[PDB]
């Protein structure tokens, strides 16, 4: 069995290997990369996502989100307070202001210590989940807006024909902006490209041990657990590496830098934070190996998780017994 310790693997494809996306995902799996829940892919030196970023300040963040925390430093939840619209130029200036800028630090490890110590005492503002793409249309390799769609995958593997679309999303981050512990909708894969700016630190639990994390989360957030049998679908709970280690939960960590891709694998729980002003692009995708995970994915029916249009068909086809209850939570 490849990668039995479930380490995060890092890949350096050649320009030739970068042509066929699906093939390279299958390659990484042949080497055991999925067992970690997360892999890093460093593009060949000849590749570029786009010519320059010199023109991105005009993008609009229609609903910036202020991430307010409650709890203790290692075990907290965050809620998103909506703020007035602002341009990327406005947001970058805010990120770099004395109130929000990254503090002096020695190295990534020092900065990680400062994040876990102090996160809860601040409320950073995140421009998340913005439909759009920063890949040049002429970039043919690993262009996240030109992937094969999840609908097409389900049609090819299962023969059924469904509505729905699959487009990328932009994320504008600043110091301490935080992504809570989650798997993807329908336990899909994700791919994330860091276009520019400061790094993103990731934490991940191997898919084979996801239920260990869920059991700890039920213990640590007991009112939330009573409210919903899949409350991590709400994407609000944070648990630190120190707390994970105290409770024996297997995990790994890695820091993504600008120019790098990360792939999350089906049912790979992940969480993390941004080091300073940055911009990422991400999208969900499927492969044939995902279908079994889609069929078994948990679902929130309490009403909190509210998701895209396109998840309807996935539930309806893969989880018909759950469909009626889940759709009530949508409506």
Q: Which stretches of the chain bind Zn ion, using CB under 5 A?
A: 228, 300, 302, 304
Q: Which residue has the tokens 């601040």?
A: 122
Q: Does residue 179 interact with ligand OGA by CB under 6 A? A: yes
The site partner of 251 among Mg ion, Ni ion, ligand OGA, none (C-beta below 5 to 8 Å per kind) is: none
Q: Helices (H), strands (E): how many in the chain?
A: 10, 16
Stretch that binds Ni ion, among 24-32, 183-191, 244-252, 307-315 (CB under 5 A): 183-191
Q: Which is nearer to ligand OGA, 79 or 156 (CB)?
A: 79
Q: Answer left, alpha or beta for residue 159, where phi above 0 means left and psi between -120 and 50 means alpha.
A: left
User: Which stretch of DSSP H or E encloses residue 312?
Assistant: helix 311-318
> CA quadruple 62, 270, 29, 194: dihedral positive or negative?
positive
Q: Which of 78, 133, 224, 264 touches ligand OGA by CB under 6 A?
A: 264
Please give the full DSSP string across 178-223, using - where no structure is assigned: EEEEE--GGG-EEEEEEEEES-EEEEE--GGGHHHHHHHHHHHSHH
The site partner of 228 among Ni ion, Zn ion, Mg ion, none (C-beta below 5 to 8 Å per kind) is: Zn ion
Q: Which of 24, 91, 142, 171 touches ligand OGA by CB under 6 A?
A: 171
Q: Does residue 54 interact with Mg ion by CB under 5 A? A: no
| 210, 265 contact by CB (below 8 A) | no
DSSP annotation of 151: H
Residue 291, Cβ density class (10 Å: 0-12 exposed, 13-18 middle, ≥19 buried): middle
Q: Could you tell me how many residues of this chain bind ligand OGA (CB under 6 A)?
A: 8
Q: Could you tell me how many residues of this chain bind Ni ion (CB under 5 A)?
A: 1
Smallest gap from residue 264 Cβ to Ni ion (A): 6
Stretch that binds Ni ion, among 82-90, 150-158, 190-198, 318-326 (CB under 5 A): 190-198
Distances (CA, A) of 283 to 66, 118, 132: 23, 30, 10
Q: Which of 190, 274, 301, 310 touches Ni ion by CB under 5 A?
A: 190
Smallest gap from residue 217 Cβ to Zn ion (A): 13
Q: Give the nearest residue (CB) to Ni ion.
A: 190
Smallest gap from residue 119 Cβ to ligand OGA (A): 14
Distance, CA of 50 to chain centre: 22
Q: Does residue 178 interact with Ni ion by CB under 5 A? A: no
DSSP annotation of 107: S
Q: Which is nearer to ligand OGA, 154 or 280 (CB)?
A: 280
Q: Which residues are annotated as a binding site for Zn(2+)?
A: 228, 234, 300, 302
Q: Which residues bind ligand OGA (CB under 6 A)?
A: 171, 179, 190, 192, 264, 270, 280, 282
């Amino acid at each position: 069995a490849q990668n039995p310790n479930c380490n995060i693997m890092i890949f350096h494809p050649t320009k030739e290997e970068f042509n066929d996306f699906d093939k390279y995902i299958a390659y990484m799996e042949s080497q055991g990369a999925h067992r970690a829940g997360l892999a890093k892919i460093i593009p060949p030196k000849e590749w570029k996502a786009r010519e320059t970023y010199d023109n991105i300040s005009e993008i609009l963040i229609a609903t910036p989100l202020q991430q307010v925390a409650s709890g203790r430093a290692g075990v907290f939840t965050q809620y998103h307070k909506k703020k007035k619209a602002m341009t990327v130029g406005e947001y970058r200036h805010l990120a770099n202001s004395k109130k929000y800028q990254t503090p002096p630090h020695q190295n990534f490890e020092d900065l990680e210590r400062k994040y876990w110590k102090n996160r809860i005492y601040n409320s950073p503002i995140y421009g998340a989940d913005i439909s759009g793409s920063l890949f040049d249309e002429n970039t043919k390799q690993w262009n996240l807006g030109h992937l094969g769609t999840i609908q097409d995958l389900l049609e090819k593997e299962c023969g059924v024909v469904i509505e729905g679309v699959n487009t990328p999303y932009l994320y504008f981050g600043m110091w301490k902006t935080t992504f809570a512990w989650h798997t993807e909708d329908m336990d899909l894969y994700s791919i994330n490209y860091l276009h520019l700016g400061e790094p993103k630190t990731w934490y991940v639990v191997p898919p084979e041990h996801g239920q260990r994390l869920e059991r700890l989360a039920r213990e640590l957030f007991p009112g939330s657990s009573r409210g919903c049998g899949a409350f991590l679908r709400h994407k609000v709970a944070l648990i630190s590496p120190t707390v994970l280690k105290e409770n024996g939960i297997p995990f790994n960590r890695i820091t993504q830098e600008a120019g790098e891709f990360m792939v999350t694998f089906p049912y790979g729980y992940h969480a993390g934070f941004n080091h300073g002003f940055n911009c990422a692009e991400a999208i969900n995708f499927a492969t044939p190996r995902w279908i079994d995970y889609g069929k078994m994915a948990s679902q929130c029916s309490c009403g909190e998780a509210r998701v895209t249009f396109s998840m309807d068909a996935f539930v309806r086809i893969l989880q018909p017994e759950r469909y009626d209850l889940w759709k009530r939570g949508q409506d």
